[PDB]
Amino acid sequence: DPLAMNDSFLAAADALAVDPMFGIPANVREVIARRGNATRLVILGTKGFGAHLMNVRHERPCEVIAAVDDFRYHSGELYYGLPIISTDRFTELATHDRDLVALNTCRYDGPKRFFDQICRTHGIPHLNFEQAVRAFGLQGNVDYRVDDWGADIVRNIPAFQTLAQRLADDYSVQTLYAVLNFHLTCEPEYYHEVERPYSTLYFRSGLLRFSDSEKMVDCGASIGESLAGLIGVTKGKFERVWMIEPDRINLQTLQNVLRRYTDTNFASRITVHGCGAGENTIRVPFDLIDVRPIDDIIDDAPTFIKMDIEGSELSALKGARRAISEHKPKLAISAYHRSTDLLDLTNYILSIRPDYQIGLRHHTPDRWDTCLYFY
Amino acid sequence: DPLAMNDSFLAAADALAVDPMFGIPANVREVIARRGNATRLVILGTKGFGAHLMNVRHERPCEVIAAVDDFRYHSGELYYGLPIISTDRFTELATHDRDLVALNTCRYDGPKRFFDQICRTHGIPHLNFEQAVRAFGLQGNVDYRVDDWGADIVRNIPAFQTLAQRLADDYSVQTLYAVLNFHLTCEPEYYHEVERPYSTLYFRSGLLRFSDSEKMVDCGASIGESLAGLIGVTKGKFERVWMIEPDRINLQTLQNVLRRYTDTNFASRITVHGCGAGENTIRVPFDLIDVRPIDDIIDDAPTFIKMDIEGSELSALKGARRAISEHKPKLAISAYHRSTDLLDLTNYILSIRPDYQIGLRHHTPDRWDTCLYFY
Amino acid sequence: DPLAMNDSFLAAADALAVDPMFGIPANVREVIARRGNATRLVILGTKGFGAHLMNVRHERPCEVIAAVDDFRYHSGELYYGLPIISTDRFTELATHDRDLVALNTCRYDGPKRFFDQICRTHGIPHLNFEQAVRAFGLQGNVDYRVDDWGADIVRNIPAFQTLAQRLADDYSVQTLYAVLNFHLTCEPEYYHEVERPYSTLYFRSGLLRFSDSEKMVDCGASIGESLAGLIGVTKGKFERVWMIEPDRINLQTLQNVLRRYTDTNFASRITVHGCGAGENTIRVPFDLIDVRPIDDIIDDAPTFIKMDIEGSELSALKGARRAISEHKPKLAISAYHRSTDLLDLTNYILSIRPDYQIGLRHHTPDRWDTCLYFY
Amino acid sequence: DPLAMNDSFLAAADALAVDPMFGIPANVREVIARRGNATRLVILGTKGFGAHLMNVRHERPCEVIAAVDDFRYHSGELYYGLPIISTDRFTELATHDRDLVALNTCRYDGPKRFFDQICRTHGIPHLNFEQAVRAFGLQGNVDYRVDDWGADIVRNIPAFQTLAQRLADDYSVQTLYAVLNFHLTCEPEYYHEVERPYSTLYFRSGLLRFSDSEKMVDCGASIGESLAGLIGVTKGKFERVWMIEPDRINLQTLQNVLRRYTDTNFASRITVHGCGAGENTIRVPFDLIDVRPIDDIIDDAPTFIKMDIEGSELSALKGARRAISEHKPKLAISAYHRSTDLLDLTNYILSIRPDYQIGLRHHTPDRWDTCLYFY
């Protein structure tokens, strides 16, 4: 019921608080309860999050026996030391082992739905990656970006309810609750109910107005897509772009991006700053990079700050406090890097510029690119 | 300003009412005014809507001289009789002809933005397909699906304002106004502000709740994607699916789709009906097809009616009036086939079941799959 | 022993004369002897010659139960009404059926060697397509181009020995015997011992010298590859090209080919003649085509005649007798269309121009493009 | 005239001896004579041997201004620091610069013939890579594998004539002369007249007979293709395979290759030896590798030695002298690594086993895989 995600949010948080296996399929729970780390597991797919389970820090909590891939099972190649088998071989092994769980590593509809139905048809206990992380107690032993943020959410319920009340539009509220429900339940369909295309990130959110004289701080410029998006929505008309990116390979790419615009009338308005955005000026290991505050990097009052960085977005925002507090530029702040960012970043921005309106959109079919908008 | 699309809607409708060239770039208008049907045009792209301009009924209203395609300009192949040239050859011709307009046939960001910027850089008058249709007065001489619905919208302003007031949620209202603004202005960025992914059509709209015992009428079943989507969101659990599709090639495909589910426990709950959905029972040219009303095709009360058909959706709904009026199933009704469908279909449904709530989402980056939801 | 293919030729011809199952694997012969047309067969591959067995005229001589394709077995699609299964499913069926033969339809090393080894590993009786045609007595019920020419060769042994003696070089003799051995034995490795690349057909045979003033009759011009090859080996320098092609779709393609050379200094030297080459002038069903003799089509003495046509190459050569007899142009005559062509075409040409030297090369990894050279 | 390559060989060697620019197009020679290292050059293609000219040791002998690639000229990417331009931009620059030479880096028919004709049509002086190496005096400053071996051949004429006389068959003689003519003239069409497919290397040469009990030394086993080829031509029947390969990444791949045969009845007959083949036992930088003689690595008399290694093939053969001299196995020795290998390797083998017959085939459309056969 996507029209009552506030209700499901509270119910999920209460359920998880008293049951750490909340959200784990019953048939898998009973195997794990029966066999513990002798549980036999088969990875479905060789192009998904299965690498995150195999690279896991410390001894695995189950015996991984194979990976299924119908397009590779005759190659003789191993998948993280595992044999690669056909789907037919997997259903055969499953019919004869009780006791054998399948990890569906696929994230996209075609492959995911295929393997999920194969499992259902044969009554094979199965899990997606977030469910695997929770069911096998791998919190802290996987990359933080694919970790279980359930418990963190359960500790901050009132603060999330307070954020919900502060959001300017109903769709942002639905989006907030959908993201928190995904983390509480491990159910990706929550994102799917609210998601917007990747192509609409920052520039087509339904919340911001761009003029023909924008001055954009492109913080975490990567490969230049946000510059391409500003160009597109403004029809090649802006005042200034300051692109900030510390990675040396990305900076090589941006030199290629700058060359595609060399004959435009706006080429001279774009600069690239090979540093990271932070709260002060310091040279640190990234390989050393320079880190500088936004307020020192730029030389004019911005109208828009886009932010998607590997480092602390809270430190980066503090390094832009004069720009934010004095000029109230529109902001598009990526909000999916830490379980705490939706609250922490919002709380920081409002403490320095309390008259902002706030929105939230989710822009991929996966857990990436939940983005806060301030205008 | 996507937060004031109601305002832009009224302003655009007033502007168009008194200027048929409303929405056409000034530099193109001045060429067309100066040269009329001696206007020289270059088609940019060979994989877009350019086929719709070349297949146009009756003499063209401009002299089309070439098509640009950097991946094909050495092949010796013609594009609808036109030479295929490089982008460099095009900019050269443009620098020497006043007077020469470019039709950007590309609909997707990469190719579209590329050609739009090429044109801007060199000051070359350019148009997208909807702008071309309006600027050259091709209304009625192109396929109705790619025609200019501007004037139709201008004739029905109060009825659209009345629809806006009837929609249950703000995002549906924003979506309504965004779609109408696209048609009034020929500006696709209006869709982009509100669009959701194609993958979320019907089953992930943010508005409907599906149970584990759904009985779905899949009207216009095509290649079986809606069956795959119901299976996915319900995790292989439903009571019944009646798939209705009249096209013989699609029916061959559905036999393949049915075979992928032969060993599932729900295979017996799905039937295929090789007919079209209409208001009564009649055999008509499509090649003859049988047309039957939904109320006669099905044998139980449905919980959900998905509808996307080539024929009249109003006739199809009248053929389901007993199901709709007596049982109030959820409905997902594709609303983009006629300029009048948003009003006509809604008005019909409410006259037979007035207690429905109504929503609207747009599910592609193009003009396809604007869908009404009733629940 | 490729250094004694003359010996193997005679031995194979004697073996076949007294055993129609010569060349058929013993384990398959014993199944066919035991079960006849109740023999169960599995087609390996869905992209090979398997369509030739399924389209076979009259009732099949075995019960075809499935086709193996690991990249398609979950699609629900049928292969000529057959279920598509995985290789693992096939080895399972084979382990339990005696009695079950596999037809390896693959012609190229990767896929062919894969399936051949799968069969050997599991002791599964298997056949290639030529072996299938012979083992099931399908001579005359398959396309003539993929038929068993064994018996025809056995009837003409001395004439083939006489051809061998007439060939000017040892490699042509080895090639002759390799082609005849393929047909006598159904063993494609015979072609492999002598084959040259497709890219060397006509222009890079190792036998012909082309000058800078060639006048080429391109008989069966198709899609213009021979024109491209003459251009390449002569570095854009020739006197004349007469391209002869009757198929209307090929003639559309040749207009595209002619456009790629429009600015060259040799464009005016090329003409296209939309007719078939034959012995006289007649309009016949191909859809009607004009058929004309080469001697009437051309307007000058040629230096080279390339020939690869669907119709009778003997009739086509008779329609060029004045050119051949009077001017002794170099000839490249495709020799793989009929079991009789190596003898019939050579005998004809020498009767009108007896001073020619003769060579033979085979230019694909399959049975296509065995070509006679006369110079 | 491929029927007189012995004659062309001697004429080319005499021409080169007295003219180092022999084989260079006259129009390019006159530019180079006029401008020397101020010659402006355009590289055609970004996927060929152009990297060999750009990575050249020491200052370039011309000013390289751009690279042409119609599929990349809008990317903003540079090709070894060079701008990437369209073919139309190149013809424009060429029409206005005298003085501007084009290097056609393409080696395959489609792309090579395209650029060669573009150049001819516009009268643009052009060269292939071997011609570039010779015309700009880059001998010794490019990778030895793509260097000009002309002068080396001119110093060894009688020894090559002596090799020609020792070859057992006419096609080997034609092949020898074709390879030497390529190096003397820089004209790749010489290879094309004699080349056989890559798929026929070692196992389908037209010269060797393989039994069902072969014992193969696979020297330079790489990625396991020769094992796959022996398996194919013998239909999975051999006695032993000793695979010798020193590269650690190749050895990882061979473990994958061994797994594809784990259930065959010949898996136990194959061993992998992670060392290089040389004349004695020594540990040397390749990263250190073990180098051992073949006679010590193997434990039985071989029937076949295939050899294609990065190191000295003469040292490797000396490390197999007992096997070669005592048992006369068939040999397939790659002969294209050094300008001297055809003479040096043959001379060595015959000094230890003088009763061998010798053949030679060339197995790619490029300069790779000229192979000597001894049987």
Ligand SMILES: [Cl-]
């Ligand atoms: Cl299950």
Ligand SMILES: [Cl-]
């Ligand atoms: Cl413009």
Ligand SMILES: [Cl-]
């Ligand atoms: Cl077998």
Ligand SMILES: [Cl-]
């Ligand atoms: Cl030239």
